[PDB]
Every structure is written in structure tokens, then in C-alpha cells.
Design a protein around this ligand. Sequence first.
Ligand code: ZN
Ligand code: ZN
Lengths: 201, 195, 329, 327
Amino acid sequence: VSWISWFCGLRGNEFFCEVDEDYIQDKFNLTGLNEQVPHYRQALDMILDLEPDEELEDNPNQSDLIEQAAEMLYGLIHARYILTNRGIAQMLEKYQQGDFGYCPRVYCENQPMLPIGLSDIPGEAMVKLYCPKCMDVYTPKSSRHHHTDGAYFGTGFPHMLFMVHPEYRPKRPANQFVPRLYGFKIHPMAYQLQLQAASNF
Amino acid sequence: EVSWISWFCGLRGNEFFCEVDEDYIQDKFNLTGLNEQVPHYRQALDMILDLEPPNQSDLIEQAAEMLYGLIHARYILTNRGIAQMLEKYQQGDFGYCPRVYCENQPMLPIGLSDIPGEAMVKLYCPKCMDVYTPKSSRHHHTDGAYFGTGFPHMLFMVHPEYRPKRPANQFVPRLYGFKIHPMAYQLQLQAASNF
Amino acid sequence: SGPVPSRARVYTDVNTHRPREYWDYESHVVEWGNQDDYQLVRKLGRGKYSEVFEAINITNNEKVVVKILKPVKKKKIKREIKILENLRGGPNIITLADIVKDPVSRTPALVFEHVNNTDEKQLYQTLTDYDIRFYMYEILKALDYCHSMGIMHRDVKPHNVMIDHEHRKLRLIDWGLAEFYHPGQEYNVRVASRYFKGPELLVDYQMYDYSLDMWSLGCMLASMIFRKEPFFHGHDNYDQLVRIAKVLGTEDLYDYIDKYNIELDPRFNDILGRHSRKRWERFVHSENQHLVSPEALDFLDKLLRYDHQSRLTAREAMEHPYFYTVVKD
Amino acid sequence: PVPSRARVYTDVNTHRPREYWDYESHVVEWGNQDDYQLVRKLGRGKYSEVFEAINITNNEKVVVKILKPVKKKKIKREIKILENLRGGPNIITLADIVKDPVSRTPALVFEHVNNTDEKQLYQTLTDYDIRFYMYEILKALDYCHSMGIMHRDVKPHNVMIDHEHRKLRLIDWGLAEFYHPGQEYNVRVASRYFKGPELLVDYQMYDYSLDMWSLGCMLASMIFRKEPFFHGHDNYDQLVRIAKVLGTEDLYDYIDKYNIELDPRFNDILGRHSRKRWERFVHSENQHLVSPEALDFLDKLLRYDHQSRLTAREAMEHPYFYTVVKD
Ligand SMILES: [Zn+2]
Ligand SMILES: [Zn+2]
């Protein structure tokens, strides 16, 4: 069974969608990626199910490194892929299923969220979740996602998705949180006064 | 032989609860008005204070589970309850804020309604000042009324030093290095209406 | 069986001459305002029966003080409302602005006029001789007025006397334990704070009157002109009278209980013992030598008496030599 | 093969200084990208993606084209041509050239044109409307040729129409190239339906004439209401589709005149076809768009021989546009 099929079937890698091999075999879509990943030639072979030269017969230390290389390559392809009309169409199917999770804010009423990167540079920040309703970013609920790089999803993926499909934008929160103490609202003069007492401190 | 109060707070899913002092409960005055909110008030109170007593035993236990919770929400507003919750808050027993740009700020428990059975327990972050649903599913069956509608706002009023400074940075949306014109959601929000 | 009945010496029958609606607080209809008019700012003090917050009225942008009553009894809530309304407008009595409640919680709150809070820790070291004579005259204006309206405060103490030293303003607050005086009625002896309880409360004499406030007023005067807070420091109710017996003597105490046929409980006979009457000059030293005078020690002596009929009334107290310096000017 | 040359504006680029045509030497003056903020997406597909944005510094609408990673040579190329033609009649105005610091990726900022769907315009299109707008494409093509530049990708999606203000713009100069007399150019150019016969037979020494073929295919598509006109499946079939209309006869007279060697793959699939008269494509749903003037104009445009096609200026003089002159 396919490697791309294997990677997306793994735990923690629920956010990932299966990239078409039409996209990966097309050299053009991989312009620049050969100088971002080590072992580029061999990494692409494992991804595309091409048998690896009858190499790694008994190189367990070397097979492990190509596996990290193929993992980084695929992830970098993924970030580009989900910007095209086919990559979006696959994510939009997932977004409707609720694979990415629902918004933690109470007054978004469990809004289905999207994957987003804070940085496009690998090794800078892990994957965060974007809510289309409150338009803010969150830390994934499960710890199985705290080990997935944010760059593998891109900075402007969610924003691109709503430009392509404008209709999928939910309405603004109908209700808002109003604090009450003994049934009394809190005057905002009263945090200004609370925020000092912590500074002054 | 372990007391009912420490047994109840000890249970799974009940990590939000602090142990209410016995003398607070024994002081008849603190429980004024609760004798008309819960059924089987007499047997329930004994079962909380470890005093001596059919599916009746199940009904009294539910009543005592309801009774302790309505004491708890009265107790955590007082200076003794605050100090106990402040202790839990300082160890992060309630959890940390999900918003990225709060940077895992420790939260406090809050109920959206004071009436039992209307909403489960939610979480309040003092940094962004918004309310959140607990990440773990164990806290999905604890009643928000057993914490109150004004517990956090009272805690910062008693101890104002505990208020965090506002988020240093904001989430700035960027596609290919370009910011997004808020004129451009107004335009997106129609196309979904017009639809 | 035993005890002799007592009367008030002034304003004895002001309540029995006024209509039903005035003194009967259980029949009082509360007129609720709008709780959304008020928005909380900070917490100022805690209470056994209440929670105090400084709030801002959003309709006129004015500052107001909110007293949120913790669940007690419907009578005691009605009692504090009625008393506050009757005394409203009176000199140095806290003006009740509005009464509001929360329809979810059912817990009621009292909205006051915003009195500026100067804290005891600052005024204590500032307090001069003329200061005491001025402010003590203001408490008396408040007391003579509520006694004239047929009400006793029953809890006169420095916590329930707000002082605004920057504008020389004084208010007598906290009417939770106030009650209408009906001549011949027996009342509860568990009223004031222990340090400010009169001899009649400690010996279970239930038929007291306005004069109880005057004893408390003394325990305040003795606290300020001697710089000892509190003056009669007892760790329990039984000990408190022993402390009083060590100053005013045991002889006048036995004369008090014999005159009204009040019988003390078993555990009181030995621990009371015997003490002579020691002069007020004994407590004077250099820290309070500038706050004490022959006018001050005479005024205190007619305040702190065992017999409640022998104490100065609020009006007779104002006319004392001690207040000639301040009365007008 | 026999060498060929342009008829009009042959040596215009060779009399100019080097700085003009030498695009590889052009220094890119970078703007500040924070001035522009996106609103909504317009088009995609090619080596770029098009967004409508707003210039927050003066609150004006702008069109931001975000180029994908292609060659640095090609991005210099488009920039020099779009700067050299700037201010010209119906030529798209380049306002700024911006860049994103992190991604390195460049973007082109154009002046906003109000485009109305070729779909919500296709039906309303009248006989005079085609005569008006074809004339506005000719203003743009005559200017660019006189500057010594061939567009190389003339098609309906590369022509922007604002019917409300009767405004037309020729866009997308990504495939545009300078003309130098007797140079061999890449045949891999103007998408397939709008390719000229010289591109399909691998004749590399073409000129401004290529644009005049592509323009014919636009005219044929409009007046006959058939989009596209020559509907070839691949490059080989494209010439077959052209051959079934204009006849194989003239096609063989064209390849003999320049000694062009056909791919042995054309050997039989091309076959033997005769000239079909232009009145044959006219039916009852496009009749109001066809006139004797229209067909003569089209026939003089679509020809196998590139040296016998009407030039941009000569096309403007045609009896087809006598009702349009109007100052
Ligand atoms: Zn949200
Ligand atoms: Zn937060």
C-alpha cells in the first residue's frame, strides 16, 4: 500500500490530506524544494513508491535519515499543494467532516476549524488551528498534534480557502460573553484599576 | 476512613473542586436558602458531614452531590475559598488558555448560568477575558452552577495583583506577505448570504 | 419572676404616636429600581451579612456604593430598608439612593451615596484634639436624630463611622442591626461587637433603650483620647465585663444588678471578684496627653456608666463643656 | 528553411539603445508591499495568481498579480516590456513591483480595470460592439508592434472589457517578446486554439504577424458565436482543424515558399481538404453579427502565409471600421 496513504493514516497526521501523485511527478510543482531537504533524490523515490536502488539492505541508521527526509519533503509539498484548486477541494471535504477540530471559544458554538501556519519556515512553530468565525488562532486540543510543524500547512492556506470559496464563511458570533458578578456587569474602568494594582505591586 | 468532601473532590472529572471546610458547612448560616433548592436536604447534609444515616440511597447521594456543589459556589467567593482556588490556579489545575497569543495563561472555572442544569462548567482566561470549553471530556458533565457566574470577577476584585498584562502581540493574517483588507470579509460575508 | 422593667428617658413614645407603616417593617413594600443602571468597579470591604463594592452609575456617570446582602432573612432585609428610608436626609446619616435585585440570583443590593473613604491608618496619626471634639459632635448629631426618630443603632463602632478628612465629612453607616424602640419591649442581647457591648447586654437585661448607643460612643471616645484600641479588650463576653469591672469598679456593678433585680449566671460570681473604682487619669500618658482634658474625662465619665438611665442622652451630651470649642465658631 | 522578416517596424529595436530591449540587464526598483492589502481573488492557472487589492496609502483599488517561481529572466522580461509600453493606448498600466521578505516571491501591481464576465456580456454583444472593441485591440497591437514587441498570447482572457465605460485593456505580457530581425523564437507560445500555422509547423522565424492570426481567431469566435473557433485537440489536430477550413491547398503552398519540413506525423492525418467559404459558418443565432465587411476582414486576417496577413495599421483602415471611426 502507498507511502502517501501510509503517512496520512498515521496518528497525529490526521490534518494531512493525500496529495495526488500527478502533482508530485510534475517537476514544476517542486521548484526550489531540492535545496530545502537533505537526500532529495532518495526522499522523492520513497514518496513515489519507486524502489530504492536495492539499497538499505542492512543500513538501519541510513534508512532512518531518508525517512525523515521524505517526511520533510512531503510536508513541504503539502503546504504548496493545499493552495491549488485540488488541494483546497480535498481540505474542504475534511473541514466539513470536522477532522481539524472545533473552536474552543464558547460563543463560536463548536465552529469547525482549519489548519494554519504562523511561519512558513520549518522548525519555527508547530501547527495551529484557525477559526473562521472568531478569526483567531488556537493550540490543538490533543498533544498528538503538538509535534507537527506549522510550515507544512502554510501561512495563507485558510485565507486562500475563503477567497476561492467565499460562501463557506460563517456569520459573525450572534452572542458575546458579558461578565456578571451578583448580576452586575463589570465596568471597564475597573480593569484599568485592577491592571495597575498588579503593575504597581 | 476518608471524608466525603475529600472523596468527592478526589474523584475523576472533579479536579476543579476544592475541599470546602467543615466549619463553613456546620455554620448553619452559610447554607441559608439551599433548603428549598435541593430535595432530601436533611439526609444529604449528614452524608456530606460524614454523620450517621432501596434506591433511596442513590437519590440522597445525588441530592448531596447537588448540595455540596451549591455550597461550593457560595464558598469560593469568600476569602477562604478564594485562597484555596488561588492555590489550584497557581498550579494550573484548571488548564491553560487555547488562544495562541495568550501564551498558555492559566485559567479559572466559571459557569455561564447560576441555575443548575442550564450549562456545564466553562473556563475563564483573565488575559483575553473570554470564556472557553474545557479541552478534556471528563469536565463535560460537571455543572457550571457549582462554580457560579461571578467567581473569577470576584477573585480579581479581592486580589487585583493577579491580573495579567494584555497580549503583547496579535494574530496578523498573511497570504504571500500581504495583509487582508477588512473590506474583504464584508465582501465574503455577503457572498454567503446572497448565495 | 425577677427583673425590673426600664424606660428610655427621652423620645420614649415617638413610635407609638406615629402611624402603623412607620415602625412595622414587615408590612413595608420595597420599591425596586433598575440593576442595569449600576456597574461594579472595585471591592472595598467584606461583611458577615454583606459584600461592599464601589460602583459607577452608568445613567448619570456618578459614583455609588453597593452593599450586596448575603442571604439572611426577609425580615432583616426589610428592617434595614425601612430604617434607612425613615432616617434619609437626616444629618450625618447615610443616604440610601436606590434598592436593586438580580432576577436570576434573587439576592438584593443596597445603593448608597458615594462617601469618600479615608482609612483609619492615616487619620489615627493625624487626629488632633479639636478633630475629636468636631467629629464626636457629628456622631452625636446622627445619634440624636435617629433616637428622635425612635431608632437605636445598636452597633456604634469606628468601622461603622465613615470619615472623610479632606472635606471634614462624617456618616453613620451600617444599619443592619438597628431596631425601632417600643417602650417595654424585650430585645436580643447579642447585638453589638463584643468590645462595644454595654453592661446590659452582658448581664442579659433585655429591656434596654437608646442609651445602649451612648455606652458604645464612650468605648469609642475612650479609644481615641487614650490611644488604646479597643479600650475594653475582652477575648469573650464573660471576660469583657471583668475588664469593665476592673476600671469602673465592682461595687457600682452590684448596685446596678440589685436595682433592676438582674441575676447573673453561675460562672460569673468568682471571676468578677472585687475591684475598686479607678480614676480616668490613670490611663493618660504622653501619646494622648494632648487629646485629654478635664472636659474630656468628665464627658467620658458620664458616658461609661453601669446604669443605662444614668448615662448622658444624645442631646445632653452635645451641650457638654467639652463641645463649647466646636459648637458654632 | 528560408529566412523571414517583418513588414512594418522591422528595425525599430535595433536603432534603440541597448537599455531598452536588453531585459536581462534591467534593475528592478522594489516598492513597499505593506502599502497594498488584498480584497478578493480574480483568476489563476498560469505562472501567477490574480487578486483585487487596495492601496491603503491613497485608498485606491489595484490589481495584484502574484508570480509563481519561474525564471528570473522571465520576470525581468515582463517588467521591462510593461514599463516600456506604459502609457500606451489600451495597454495595462503597471503601478508598482513588490516583494515578500520571507517567501522571496515577487508580485506585480497593476491599475484596476473593471472586468465584466465574458459570460454576462456574450449575450448582449451587438454588431457595433464587436466593431468598437476589435478596433480598441488594434490600437493596442499597433502601438506594441511599433515599440517592437509581439504579444504572443492574444485571446479573450487576455483582453479586459469594461462595457459600462466602453473601456478595453490588453493584459498579460508574460509571454511577450522583443522583435529582432531574423531571430528564431520558441514555438511553445500562444495557447493551442490561438496558435498560428507557423507555430504548429515549427517555423521559428515569425514576427508581429502571429498576433494578427490570434486576433482573427478572436473575430471568428465572436461573429460566429463559436468559442473557440478552431477547436483542435492537440497541436497536430489543430492544424487539421485549420486545414479543413482554409484548405490543405494553401498550406502546402506556404510550406514550399519557406522550405519548412513537416513532421512525418502530419503525413496522412492532414489529408486533402478544400477552401470552405466563410458564409458557411453563419447561422440563425449569429446572423446579426456577420456582414460582407466582416468576412473580408476575417479572410484577410486568417492566412497561412504570415507575410500576407493584414498589419495592425492596415487592419484599422478596413471597411469594417468605417461605422466606428466617429472621431
Ligand atoms: Zn472561534
Ligand atoms: Zn486567553
